[PDB]
Amino acid sequence: AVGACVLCNSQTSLRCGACIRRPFLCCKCCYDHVISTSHKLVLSVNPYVCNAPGCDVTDVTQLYLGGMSYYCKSHKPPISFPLCANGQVFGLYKVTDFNAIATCDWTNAGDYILANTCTERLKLFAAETLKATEETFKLSYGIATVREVLSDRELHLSWEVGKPRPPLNRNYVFTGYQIGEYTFEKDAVVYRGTTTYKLNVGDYFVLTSHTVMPLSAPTLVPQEHYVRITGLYPTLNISDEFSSNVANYQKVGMQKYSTLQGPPGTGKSHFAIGLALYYPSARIVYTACSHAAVDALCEKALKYLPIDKCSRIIPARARVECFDKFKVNSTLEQYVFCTVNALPETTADIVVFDEISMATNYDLSVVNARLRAKHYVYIGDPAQLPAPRTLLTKGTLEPEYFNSVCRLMKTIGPDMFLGTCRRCPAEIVDTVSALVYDNKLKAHKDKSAQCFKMFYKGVITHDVSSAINRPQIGVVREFLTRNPAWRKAVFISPYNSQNAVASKILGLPTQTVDSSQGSEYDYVIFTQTTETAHSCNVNRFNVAITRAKVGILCIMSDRDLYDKLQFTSLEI
Ligand SMILES: [Zn+2]
Ligand SMILES: [Zn+2]
Ligand SMILES: [Zn+2]
């Protein structure tokens, strides 16, 4: 009931009853809010509503202070004061950007632009409002119910009518009923339940709708620059293997927080684990939003750090199988590997937050609120993929607006940049260097002469909204017959339905561009499928072609990206 104004910090009893998150607004800011938005309900110790029996006047601009109570113009006594007047709303302790965040529906890109350009307190207000909006929207979808048990991995389903049916993709992890988190993918559909339980006919599932907690900590702590390495103890016996990062590790210890832009295969995980060998007594918490990003840090640590000082934090609700080689759930070990949403309340000498393009301002804040560290390291690449914004349907979200860390990397530049790609053949490195890295990314490898491109629009079919291009898969089939070494390639496309079709026709392992991020393969076969904003997205295209260590075949739909690929063209 008592607190500080989100816009000016002036103390108040006044909150907005029309905002989904009921923020405290001072007498001045509350007035500026109510008089320019449809938000007219104001909440003090008691709500600002007409106290006359049966009266439904709740608009603050139509209410007055009559004695110790509130009344409308129709019910107030002769000695009464308007609650709204003189640029202030009556309350104890006596804007444009706040209004827009408070009233938007989060379906436009401009909403996320504003949520990243505003003041720090407005960033938390926006992040809390957005996440609560996202969670409420999850209730709009309808409940599902098991129609039959086709086999151990397949089935056919039934829905409750009247409410919209969400898409069948590995993008919507539903929680099961308490029978583990289930997922779906394409009348013969596939039930993907992480927990091996015979799906009882009649049971139901609901979207993973977790309650949104308030944010208190900023997305980024205030920057502090030091003249000496603070609270960390370096070595001069630093392995030659990590010597290239020595100046950057010293930079880490001389600032409160630091940003590292690491293009694909430039050594992000090597840098993160090497930071532990450079400050060998430091307690490091390694965090990322996904279990995949956390497990990739676990694999690198397994090679350089002592296994007895590592612990993989796994929440009681075992969602998917993750890293099995560290002692599970020991918060006090020197090296703790844990996803953002599962972080314990602890302190650290260094916090390493990896895959920063996938973080939201909500995640940035959670880390600041759960971990109190001497140093914070943000590793990622704003030229890679951001977290999916399920409400966003209009406009494209540019990298400078992914989150606060990405905004800094795009506006003032990152503090550290890993300039040499060690993974990809030079054809790929040269293409992405010009496309998203302003020619600052260099190739370690020579050209492989196994990077091919083909311009083939094919035929686009749609599975509801997800796209398929059977002729592009047919072209891959013909290529495989003449290129048997490509037998072990991973098939990548921007669409789950295209991948399901390629999996049956080609028999190759499949991956969407979004799920390939952070992974690498000798050979990659990419079919663009369509020429939509989704399939032409430069960050997605960058991720797609940088998965390859040796060769890549790109079957393209977009002339622009096809011309930019510095690959040998194929005919047919
Ligand atoms: Zn104020
Ligand atoms: Zn409001
Ligand atoms: Zn009244």
Residue numbers in the entry: 1 to 94, 103 to 185, 194 to 202, 207 to 592
Sentences from the paper on this structure:
The SARS-CoV-2 Non-structural protein 13 (NSP13) has been identified as a target for anti-virals due to its high sequence conservation and essential role in viral replication. NSP13 contains 5 domains, a N-terminal Zinc binding domain (ZBD) that coordinates 3 structural Zinc ions, a helical “stalk” domain, a beta-barrel 1B domain and two “RecA like” helicase subdomains 1 A and 2 A that contain the residues responsible for nucleotide binding and hydrolysis. A long 30 amino acid linker that does not adopt any secondary structure links the 1B to the 1A and 2A RecA-like core helicase domains. The nucleotide binding site is situated in a cleft between the 1A and 2A domains with specific contacts to the nucleotide provided by conserved helicase motifs I, II, and III in the 1A domain and IV, V, and VI in the 2A domain.
The phosphate-bound NSP13 crystals show robust crystallization behavior and routinely diffract to around 2.0 Å resolution, sufficient for the reliable identification of binders. X-ray analysis of the majority of crystals showed no bound compounds; however, 65 bound fragments were found within 52 datasets using the PANDDA algorithm. Some of the hits were found in pockets predicted to be of functional importance, including the nucleotide and nucleic acid binding sites (the bound fragment structures are be referred to by the corresponding PBD depositions). Our analysis of the mechanism has also allowed us to identify fragments that may serve as possible starting points for allosteric inhibition based on their ability to interfere with or block structural transitions that form part of the catalytic cycle. Whilst these fragments do represent useful starting points for inhibitor development they have not yet been validated as inhibitors in biochemical assays or as binders in alternate biophysical assays and are not expected to be potent inhibitors without further optimization (see, for example,34–36).
